[PDB]
Design a protein around this ligand. Structure first.
Ligand SMILES: Nc1ncnc2c1ncn2[C@@H]1O[C@H](COP(=O)(O)OP(=O)(O)OP(=O)(O)O)[C@@H](O)[C@H]1O
Ligand SMILES: Nc1ncnc2c1ncn2[C@@H]1O[C@H](COP(=O)(O)OP(=O)(O)O)[C@@H](O)[C@H]1O
Ligand SMILES: Nc1ncnc2c1ncn2[C@@H]1O[C@H](COP(=O)(O)OP(=O)(O)O)[C@@H](O)[C@H]1O
Ligand SMILES: Nc1ncnc2c1ncn2[C@@H]1O[C@H](COP(=O)(O)OP(=O)(O)O)[C@@H](O)[C@H]1O
Ligand SMILES: [Mg+2]
Ligand SMILES: [Mg+2]
Lengths: 146, 137, 97, 901, 193, 48
C-alpha cells in the first residue's frame, strides 16, 4: 500500500502517481484527510470514473464528517461511518477485534486478563463521555491511541 | 508530572504535546527537560507560512544534528500543511523505532540520516485565536 | 426537437451512450470541458459539421458562449462564428450536446 | 534624568512639570516608562489617541542620549500599513530563497552591526494596531528566549541594547499570550492636558516662523501675545470644546483634531496679516487693528474647527452658546448666526452673502462641470478649504453623495495655482498599491544624503492626492484598514517604507484630500481616531430648497436666452424641477433599493438634457418645453426603478407637478403615453412617435443582420425605449452604461445594435478557462490604445460573468472613474504608448511636449471615445456587493433597469 | 565634520563662507556615500574570494558564476592597486567613476551571492549544524575559514551554550569553548588548523 | 533594392544589424533578451 496525507502540492502529485501505478499494477493506495481538498476531490472522482482499474485494487480515502465533501464523490464512493461504538459490548467487541491474538496470547497468562480489564475501563469511560456533561465536564478524546 | 508524561512519550518513540492556557510553563518545561537530559533544544515560533518544504528542511536538520525541537503554537500551521507534516512526523518516528530495534528514512524525497537523541515537541493553546485543529492521524 | 442546444443531466450515462449510439453515422468525438484537447475538438466539429458531446458541464468554458447564442456573421457568401480570437467558418450541420 | 528631561522639553517646546504642576503626570509616566525599559525588553505604551506616548518615549530617548553619551536610534514600523509578508519575509515556492521583511531586515542590520549598531541604543517602535496575526510571531522574541524564528530555520537572537516597543491605541484584539510578555505603561487622556497643548502651540508660535527679528516673527509673537488670555485656564477655547463634545457630529469628535484645526486656522490668520503688511508697505499693521482682527478670527476659527463637521442647527447652537458665554465683540444679529459672518482684514465682521452677487453665466458653458454657482455654503466652504490647503494640511470632505464635495475642492484649488490634483477613487479592495502606483506615475524617487525623497515631477508644484471613497476600504477581522494606516503613517511620520529594499522614503511636496460619505451609510466604515486626529473634517450637506431654487434658476434663465418667448417660463420650471426632485428624494430611499440615491447631480443632468435639446431648435412652444422637461424627468427618475408601481407613481407625479406649476396648457400636447425623443429620423433631437420609429428600427435591424450579427429579433415598445436610452448614453461624453436584467433579455445584442448605429466598435474580452488578470490587463491596454491613440470610438461591453476576481473590478472602477488606470502602462508598454500618443497628437494636429501633457491628452481621448456597458443580473446581495466594491458603477454609470420581460 | 558644517550653516555669519562651505559639505556627503558603498563591497568580496579560492571543483559545477567572479575580482584588484598607488582619501574620492563602479560591483557581488544557495545546501548537508545558519552567515563562515575571528559571533546560532571558542595566538589551535558570560571549558585534546 | 541587400550583407557578415533595433524596439529586445538569458541560465548585466 501507499499512504499519502492530503494537503500539499507534492502530496497531490504523489497521490496521482501512486493511483496511476496502482491502476497499472494492482496494489492498494491510500490518501487521508481528503476533506481539506474538495476541489481536488472533484477531479479525483472524475478521473476515477474515467479510468478502468485493475481487478484487485482498492482506493481507501478518509475524511471527517464535513459538508464540504463533494456530493458526486460521496455518491460514487462506498461510505463507512467510524463513530465511537454505542454500548459496552460494542466497545469490547471493537477492542478485541483490534487487539491481535498473537500479542494478547503471549506469556504470562494474566496478559489477556489485564487487556480485558483495560477494555472494560475504556468502555466505561467512553460511555461516560457519551453521557456528557455529567459523566465528564468536557468531551475528552479517549480512543485507540490511548 | 510533565517530566513523567514526556519521558513516557519519549520511550514510546512518540512526541510530546503539552497544552493549556498561556503562561502555564509549557515551553520552559520542555526546555528544562531537554537541558536536564543534556540535549540541544531548538525553539520554533511556528507560523502559517511554515511550508511543507520548510518543515521538512528543519526536520532533516534536527534529525542530522540529534537535537530537540519545540514547536510553540503548533496549531497555527493551517489544516492542510499540518496534515502534510503528519507524514514526516510518522516517518521520523518510524526511523526512531528502527534505531531502537545507516539508519535513514526519506524526508523531502531525499535520504537523510536520523540520530537517536532527537525529539519532536509541540506546544499549543486550544482556541487562542480560532486556530487550526490537529488531524487525528 | 430542441432549438437551443441540450444539457443532459444523467447520473447514469444511459442518455450519454444513447446519444453516442444515435449519432454514429455522424461520428461524435467525445470530449470534456476539462481536457486540453477541447478547443481543437470544438473547432474541428464547427468546421466539419460533426456532432459533439461535451461532458463535465459544471466546469463550463465561456468560450462556448457565441456558439450557444448562434452569433453568426454572414459577410459575403461566408458564414462565420467567433471562437475566442480566431474566426471559424461555421458548418450548417453542427450540433453540440 | 529629571533635569535632562526638563532641558529637552525646553528644546522641544514641551511643558515640563515638577510633580504637582501641569506636566507632573506626564513626567511621571516618562519615568515609569524608563523604569520598565530598565526591567523589561518587551514594552507597550497603551492609551487613547493624543495622550503623550510618542512625545514621552522621544523625550526619554533624547534625555538618555544626553545623559549617557550613547546616541539612540528609533525605528518606527507601522505593522498594519504593509502586509505580514512584507513585515517579516517570504520563502519563494519556486526557488527556496528567503527575502527579509521590514522588521527582520532592521533586526538583522542591528545584529550585523556593520556601522556599529550594537554600541547604540536601538528602539524598535511598532506604531499601529495589534492582532495575533503578526505579534504571535513576536511571542518568542518577547519571551525570555529572545529569538526571532523564521520559516527557513534562521533564528535571530535579540541583543541586549535593543528594546521592542508597541505604541497602541487599544488592546481589543490582543490576546493574553501577547499581553503577558510585555510590560505595560498606561497613558490616560488626563495625562496630556489641553493646557499642555495650548502651551505647545503658543511656544511654536513664538518660535519657528511660518515663512521658511523678522516681520513674520514679530507678527506671530504679537498674535500669540494677544490670543494668550483665551487659551490658559478655562478661558474660551476649553469651554467651547467642552460644549462641542456634547453636540452630535458625523465623525467622532476628538480633542486633538479640533485643536490642530484651530491651530492651522490661526497660522492662516498670521499669514493673512503678513500678506496685508506686504500689500500696504507705507502703513504698517496697527496693534489695535491686529487685536480687533485676531479677537474675531479666533471666534470664527473655533466655531469652524469645532462645528465644521456638524449640521447647520448644531453649528448655530455652538455659535449661540459662544455668544451667550464669551465677552467678545460680536455682530448685532437677531436671527442670522455667527457662522454666516466672516472676518475682514480690517478687523470687522462682514456678511458672507456680500461676497458673491447673482451671476449671469453665458449660454455656451451654462451648466458645464467647471461652472459653479456661488452660494453662502459654497463661499464658506471655499474659504475653509483654501485655509486647510494653504498649510498643506490633510483634510476630509464628508457628506451625502452629490452634495458638492468634489466641485468645492476644485473651486478652492482654482484659487491656488501652485497645486495639482490627482484623483484617486477608493473601493472595498483598495490597498496602498493604488497610492504607490500614483506615486510611480506622478513622482520620482530621489536619493539624497539625508535619505530617499519622493517628490513630484513638476518642480515647484505641490501634488494633491484626492481620495474619493476613504470610508470604503475593507476593515479586517481586527478592525484595521491597511490603506488608512498607510495614509496615517505618511501624514504623521512624513513618509513610508519602500518594500523593495526596506528603505524609509520621505515625502517632500505631497498632500492628501479625502472625500467620503457618512459612516452610517451601508458600505462605509468609521475612520480610525489616530488617523482622524491629523485630518480636519468638514460636513457638506445638501443645498436645500431655498439654495437649489436659485442655483438652478440661474441655469434656467441662462439657457432660456436663445429664444425670448420662453424666458418668462423659467421660475415656474425651476420650481417644478425642485419640487419633483424633492418628492422623488423623499419617496425613493436607500433602504428600499441600494441605488436609490438622488442628488443635485440629477438636477444638473436635467439642465443638461433640456439645454442640449434646446440648442439646435431655436423655436419651441410651452407644450414642447413641458414635453422635454417631462422626458428628461422620466429618463432621470424612472430608468433606475424596479417596481411598476414606482414607475407609475413617478409618471403620475410628473403629471401632477407639471399641471400644478403650468396651468392653462395643452394637456394632450404636453403629455403623451409613449413620449419618445430621437435624433435618428432628422438632424435634430426632436420627438418621435412609435410607428415610424418602429419602421425605421425594423429597417436598421434588416441592414444590421447581414453586417454584424445575423440574429433576428422581435420588436416592442420596451425595445424601442431601451435602444433610445442606450443611444442617449452613447451620445453623451464619458457615457458608461449599467444594464440590470435577466439573462437572455437582449441586453448585449441591443447594445451592439446601438453601437453599430452610432459607429462605435464593440469590444468583448472573450473570457475562457485559465483567463487571468494579466490577460485582462492586456485586453484593457489594447482597448485604451485603440480608444486614445487611434481616435476610435469603442463600446466596451462587459458581463458580470467576465469578472473573475477583485482586480478586474478594481481596474474597471478606476477606468470608469478617471478615464485612466495608473500602473497599467509600465516600462516598454508605457514607452510604446508614449510614441503612439505622440503620433496620434501629430495626426490630430496638436503640438505637445514631454510625457505628462501627452498622457493627459491620452486620458482626454479615452474619456471622449471609450464607452463601457456593464451587464449583470438583479440580486440584492449582488447589487450591494457591487456598490461596495465598485462605486463608479453607481456614480459614473447610468443605470437602466431592464428587468424581466 | 558634517555635523559641524551643518552647525556653522545656521548661524551667525554663514553668508561669508557659504560658497566654500556648500561645496565642502557636498564633498563630505559624496565621500560618506562612497565609503558606505566601499565597506559593503569589501565585506562581500572577502568571503566570496575565500569561498571561490579555498573550495575546489567550484568551476566544474558553477562555471559561469566562477568566471563572472574572476572577471569582477580582476577589476577589484585593479582598484586595489590604484588605491595603493594613490593612498590619499581625497585622491580616491577624485578617482573618475569610482562611485558608479562601486555601485555596479556591489550589484554584481550581490547577484553572485544570491546565486550560491545550491552550493550552500551541500555544505549544510556536510555539517548538520549549518542547517540552523542563514545563507549570509554560512557564506561568511565558509569564506573566513582561514581567518577564524569573524566566526566567533556565529557559534551562538549553531550551538546551545557555546558562544565563542578559545584560540591560540597562532590562530591554528582551538583551546576550548566559552559561554556568553565568561564560563569556559578547556579541551583535553585540542584540534589542529 | 540595395537597402534589402545591405542589411542582409551586414547580417550575414556579423550576425547583427546596427540600427535595426531603435527606439522602443531596442527596449523590447532588451527585455526579451533578459528573459531569454534568464531561461538559459546565464546572468548578464547591462545592455552591452
Ligand atoms: N508634555 C507635553 N507638553 C506639551 N504638548 C505636548 C506634550 N506631550 C504631547 N504634547 C502634544 O500632544 C500632541 C499629541 O501627543 P502625542 O504626539 O504624544 O500623541 P500620542 O499619544 O502618541 O497619540 P497617537 O495615539 O495618536 O499616536 C503632540 O503633537 C504635542 O503637540
Ligand atoms: N516551574 C517553574 N519555575 C520557575 N518559573 C516557571 C516555572 N514554570 C513556568 N515558569 C515561568 O513562567 C513563564 C511561562 O512561560 P512559558 O513556559 O512560555 O509558558 P507557556 O509556554 O504556557 O506560554 C516563563 O517565563 C517561566 O520563566
Ligand atoms: N451651487 C452650485 N452650483 C453649481 N452646481 C452645483 C451647486 N450645488 C450643487 N451642484 C451640483 O451638485 C453636484 C455634486 O457633484 P460632485 O461634487 O461631483 O459629487 P460629490 O458631492 O459626491 O463630490 C454637481 O454635479 C453640481 O453640478
Ligand atoms: N427581442 C428579441 N427577439 C428575439 N430574440 C431575442 C430578443 N432579445 C434577445 N433574444 C435572444 O437572446 C439571445 C442573446 O441574448 P443576450 O443579448 O445575450 O441577452 P443578455 O445580454 O441579457 O444575456 C439571442 O440569441 C436572441 O435569440
Ligand atoms: Mg509557550
Ligand atoms: Mg503617536
Amino acid at each position: 500500500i501507499t499512504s499519502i496525507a492530503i494537503g500539499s502540492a507534492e502530496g497531490f502529485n504523489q497521490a496521482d502517481k501512486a493511483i496511476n501505478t496502482a491502476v497499472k499494477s494492482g496494489r492498494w493506495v491510500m490518501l487521508k484527510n481528503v476533506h481539506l481538498a474538495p476541489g481536488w476531490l472533484m477531479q479525483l472522482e472524475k478521473k476515477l470514473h474515467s479510468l478502468q482499474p485493475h481487478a484487485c485494487f482498492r482506493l481507501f480515502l478518509t475524511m471527517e464528517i464535513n459538508p464540504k465533501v463533494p456530493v458526486n464523490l460521496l455518491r460514487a464512493g462506498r461510505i463507512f461511518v467510524f463513530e465511537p461504538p454505542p454500548g459496552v459490548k460494542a466497545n469490547m467487541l471493537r477492542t478485541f477485534s483490534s487487539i491481535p491474538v498473537s500479542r494478547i496470547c503471549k506469556s504470562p497468562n494474566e496478559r489477556a486478563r489485564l487487556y480485558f480489564l483495560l477494555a472494560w475501563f475504556h468502555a466505561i469511560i467512553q460511555e461516560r463521555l457519551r453521557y456528557a456533561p455529567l459523566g465528564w465536564s468536557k468531551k475528552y478524546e479517549f480512543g485507540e491511541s490511548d | 508530572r510533565c517530566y513523567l508524561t514526556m519521558t513516557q512519550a519519549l520511550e514510546a518513540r512518540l512526541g510530546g504535546s503539552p497544552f493549556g492556557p498561556a503562561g502555564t510553563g509549557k515551553t520552559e518545561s520542555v526546555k528544562a527537560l531537554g537541558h536536564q537530559l543534556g540535549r540541544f533544544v531548538l525553539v520554533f515560533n511556528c507560523d502559517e507560512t511554515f511550508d511543507f518544504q520548510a518543515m521538512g528542511r528543519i526536520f532533516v536538520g534536527l534529525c542530522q544534528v540529534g537535537a530537540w525541537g519545540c514547536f510553540d503554537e503548533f496549531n497555527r500551521l493551517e489544516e492542510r500543511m499540518l496534515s502534510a507534516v503528519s507524514q514526516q512526523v510518522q516517518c521520523i518516528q518510524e526511523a526512531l523505532r528502527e534505531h531502537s530495534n545507516p539508519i535513514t528514512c526519506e524526508l523531502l524525497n531525499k535520504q537523510v540520516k536520523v540520530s537517536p537523541d532527537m525529539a519532536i515537541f509541540i506546544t499549543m493553546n486550544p482556541g487562542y485565536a480560532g486556530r487550526s485543529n490537529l488531524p487525528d492521524n | 426537437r430542441f432549438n437551443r442546444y441540450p444539457l443532459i443531466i444523467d447520473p447514469s450515462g444511459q442518455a450519454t451512450e444513447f446519444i453516442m449510439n444515435e449519432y454514429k453515422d455522424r461520428k461524435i468525438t467525445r470530449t470534456s470541458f476539462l481536457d486540453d484537447a477541447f478547443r481543437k475538438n470544438l473547432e474541428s466539429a464547427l468546421r466539419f459539421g460533426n456532432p459533439l458531446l461535451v461532458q463535465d458541464v459544471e466546469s463550463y468554458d465561456p468560450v462556448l458562449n457565441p456558439v450557444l447564442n448562434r452569433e453568426v456573421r454572414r459577410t459575403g457568401g461566408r458564414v462565420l462564428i467567433t471562437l475566442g480570437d480566431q474566426d471559424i467558418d461555421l458548418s450548417p450541420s453542427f450540433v453540440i450536446f | 534624568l529629571r533635569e535632562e528631561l526638563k532641558k529637552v522639553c525646553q528644546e522641544m517646546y514641551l511643558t515640563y512639570g515638577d510633580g504637582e504642576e501641569v506636566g507632573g503626570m506626564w513626567v511621571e509616566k516618562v519615568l515609569q516608562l524608563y523604569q520598565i525599559t530598565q526591567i523589561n525588553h518587551g514594552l507597550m505604551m497603551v492609551g487613547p489617541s493624543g495622550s503623550g506616548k510618542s512625545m514621552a518615549w522621544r523625550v526619554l530617548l533624547k534625555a538618555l542620549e544626553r545623559l549617557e553619551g550613547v546616541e539612540g536610534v528609533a525605528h518606527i514600523i507601522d505593522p498594519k500599513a504593509i502586509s505580514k509578508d512584507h513585515l517579516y519575509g517570504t520563502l519563494d515556492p519556486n526557488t527556496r530563497e528567503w527575502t527579509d521583511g521590514l522588521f527582520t531586515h532592521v533586526l538583522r542590520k542591528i545584529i550585523d552591526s556593520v556601522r556599529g549598531e550594537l554600541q547604540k541604543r536601538q528602539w524598535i517602535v511598532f506604531d499601529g494596531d495589534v492582532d495575533p496575526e503578526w505579534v504571535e510571531n513576536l511571542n518568542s522574541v518577547l519571551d525570555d528566549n529572545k529569538l526571532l524564528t523564521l520559516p527557513n530555520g534562521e533564528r535571530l537572537s535579540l541583543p541586549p541594547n535593543v528594546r521592542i516597543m508597541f505604541e497602541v491605541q487599544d488592546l481589543k484584539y490582543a490576546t493574553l499570550a501577547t499581553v503577558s510578555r510585555c510590560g505595560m505603561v498606561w497613558f490616560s487622556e488626563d495625562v496630556l492636558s489641553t493646557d499642555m497643548i495650548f502651551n505647545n502651540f503658543l511656544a511654536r508660535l513664538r518660535s519657528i516662523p511660518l515663512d521658511e527679528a523678522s516681520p513674520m516673527l514679530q507678527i506671530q509673537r504679537d498674535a500669540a501675545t494677544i490670543m494668550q488670555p483665551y487659551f490658559t485656564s478655562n478661558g474660551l477655547v476649553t469651554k467651547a470644546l467642552e460644549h462641542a463634545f456634547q453636540l452630535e457630529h458625523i465623525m467622532d469628535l476628538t480633542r486633538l483634531r479640533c485643536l490642530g484645526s484651530l491651530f492651522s486656522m490661526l497660522h492662516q490668520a498670521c499669514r493673512n496679516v503678513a500678506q496685508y503688511n506686504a500689500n500696504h508697505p507705507d502703513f504698517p499693521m496697527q496693534i489695535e487693528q491686529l487685536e480687533r482682527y485676531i479677537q474675531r478670527y479666533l471666534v470664527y476659527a473655533i466655531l469652524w474647527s469645532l462645528s465644521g463637521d456638524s449640521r447647520l442647527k448644531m453649528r448655530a447652537e455652538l455659535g449661540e452658546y459662544i455668544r451667550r458665554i464669551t465677552t467678545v465683540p460680536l455682530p448685532t444679529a437677531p436671527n442670522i448666526p455667527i457662522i454666516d459672518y466672516e472676518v475682514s482684514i480690517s478687523g470687522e465682521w462682514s456678511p458672507w452673502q456680500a461676497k458673491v452677487p447673482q451671476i449671469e453665466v453665458e449660454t455656451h458653458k451654462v451648466a458645464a462641470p467647471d461652472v459653479v454657482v456661488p452660494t453662502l455654503d459654497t463661499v464658506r466652504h471655499e474659504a475653509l478649504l483654501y485655509t486647510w490647503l494653504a498649510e498643506h494640511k490633510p483634510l476630509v470632505l464628508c457628506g451625502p453623495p452629490g452634495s458638492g464635495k468634489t466641485m468645492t475642492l476644485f473651486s478652492a484649488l482654482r484659487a491656488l495655482p501652485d497645486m495639482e490634483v490627482v484623483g484617486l477613487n477608493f473601493s472595498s479592495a483598495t490597498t496602498p498599491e493604488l497610492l504607490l502606483k500614483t506615486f510611480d506615475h506622478y513622482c520620482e524617487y530621489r536619493r539624497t544624503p539625508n535619505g530617499v525623497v519622493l517628490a513630484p515631477v513638476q518642480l515647484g508644484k505641490w501634488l494633491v492626492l484626492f481620495c474619493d471613497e476613504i470610508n470604503l476600504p475593507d476593515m479586517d477581522k481586527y478592525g484595521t484598514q491597511r490603506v488608512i494606516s498607510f495614509i496615517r503613517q505618511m501624514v504623521e511620520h512624513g513618509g513610508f517604507y519602500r518594500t523593495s529594499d526596506q528603505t524609509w522614503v520621505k515625502l517632500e511636496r505631497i498632500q492628501f484630500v479625502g472625500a467620503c460619505n457618512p459612516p452610517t451609510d451601508p458600505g462605509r466604515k468609521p475612520l480610525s481616531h489616530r488617523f482622524l486626529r491629523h485630518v480636519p473634517v468638514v460636513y457638506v450637506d445638501y443645498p436645500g430648497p431655498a439654495s437649489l431654487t436659485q442655483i438652478y434658476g440661474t441655469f434656467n434663465r441662462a439657457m432660456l436666452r436663445l429664444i425670448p418667448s420662453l424666458r418668462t417660463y423659467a421660475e415656474p420650471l425651476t420650481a417644478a424641477m425642485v419640487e419633483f426632485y424633492t418628492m422623488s428624494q423623499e419617496r425613493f430611499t436607500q433602504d428600499t433599493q441600494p441605488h436609490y440615491i438622488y442628488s443635485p447631480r440629477e438636477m444638473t443632468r436635467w439642465v443638461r438634457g433640456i439645454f442640449e435639446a434646446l440648442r439646435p431648435l431655436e423655436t419651441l412652444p410651452v407644450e414642447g418645453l413641458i414635453r422635454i422637461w417631462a422626458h428628461e424627468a422620466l429618463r432621470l427618475f424612472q430608468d433606475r426603478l424596479v417596481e411598476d408601481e414606482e414607475r407609475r407613481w413617478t409618471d403620475e407625479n410628473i403629471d401632477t407637478v407639471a399641471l400644478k406649476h403650468f396651468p392653462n396648457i395643452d394637456r394632450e400636447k404636453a403629455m403623451s403615453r409613449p413620449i419618445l425623443y430621437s435624433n435618428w429620423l432628422s438632424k435634430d433631437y426632436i420627438p418621435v412617435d412609435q410607428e415610424e420609429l418602429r419602421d425605421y428600427v425594423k429597417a436598421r435591424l434588416k441592414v444590421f443582420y447581414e453586417e454584424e450579427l445575423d440574429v433576428p429579433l422581435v420588436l416592442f415598445n420596451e425595445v424601442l425605449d431601451h435602444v433610445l436610452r442606450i443611444d442617449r448614453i452613447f451620445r453623451q461624453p464619458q457615457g458608461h452604461l449599467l444594464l440590470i436584467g435577466v439573462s437572455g433579455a437582449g441586453k448585449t445584442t441591443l447594445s451592439r445594435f446601438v453601437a453599430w448605429m452610432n459607429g462605435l466598435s464593440v469590444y468583448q474580452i472573450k473570457v475562457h478557462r485559465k483567463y487571468t488578470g494579466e490577460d485582462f490587463d492586456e485586453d484593457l491596454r489594447t482597448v485604451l490604445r485603440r480608444s486614445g491613440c487611434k481616435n476610435e470610438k469603442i463600446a466596451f461591453i462587459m458581463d458580470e460573468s467576465n469578472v473573475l476576481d477583485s482586480g478586474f473590478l478594481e481596474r474597471m472602477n478606476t477606468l470608469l472613474a478617471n478615464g485612466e488606470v495608473p500602473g497599467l502602462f509600465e516600462g516598454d508598454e508605457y514607452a510604446t504608448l508614449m510614441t503612439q500618443c505622440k503620433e496620434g497628437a501629430q495626426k490630430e494636429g496638436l503640438m505637445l511636449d514631454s510625457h505628462e501633457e501627452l498622457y493627459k491628452w491620452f486620458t482626454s481621448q479615452v474619456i471622449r471615445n471609450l464607452h463601457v456597458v456593464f451587464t449583470m443580473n438583479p440580486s440584492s446581495e449582488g447589487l450591494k456587493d457591487r456598490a461596495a466594491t465598485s462605486p463608479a458603477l453607481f456614480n459614473r454609470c447610468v443605470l437602466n433597469w431592464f428587468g424581466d420581460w | 565634520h558634517i555635523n559641524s558644517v551643518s552647525a556653522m550653516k545656521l548661524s551667525p555669519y554663514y553668508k561669508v563662507f557659504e560658497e566654500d562651505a556648500l561645496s565642502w559639505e557636498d564633498k563630505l556627503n559624496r565621500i560618506m556615500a562612497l565609503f558606505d558603498v566601499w565597506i559593503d563591497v569589501q565585506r562581500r568580496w572577502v568571503y566570496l574570494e575565500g569561498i571561490f579560492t579555498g573550495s575546489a571543483d567550484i568551476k566544474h559545477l558553477l562555471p559561469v558564476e566562477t568566471q563572472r567572479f574572476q572577471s569582477i575580482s580582476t577589476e577589484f584588484l585593479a582598484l586595489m592597486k590604484k588605491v595603493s598607488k594613490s593612498p590619499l582619501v581625497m585622491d580616491v574620492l577624485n578617482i573618475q567613476g569610482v562611485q558608479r563602479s562601486l555601485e555596479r560591483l556591489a550589484d554584481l557581488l550581490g547577484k553572485i551571492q544570491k546565486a550560491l544557495g545550491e552550493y550552500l545546501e551541500r555544505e549544510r548537508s556536510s555539517f548538520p549544524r549549518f542547517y540552523f545558519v542563514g545563507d549570509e552567515d554560512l557564506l561568511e563562515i565558509i569564506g573566513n575559514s582561514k581567518n577564524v575571528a569573524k566566526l566567533q559571533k556565529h557559534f551562538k546560532k549553531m550551538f546551545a551554550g557555546v558562544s565563542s571558542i578559545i584560540l591560540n595566538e597562532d590562530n591554528s589551535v582551538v583551546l576550548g569553548i566559552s559561554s556568553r558570560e565568561g564560563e569556559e571549558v578547556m579541551f583535553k585534546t585540542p584540534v589542529s588548523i
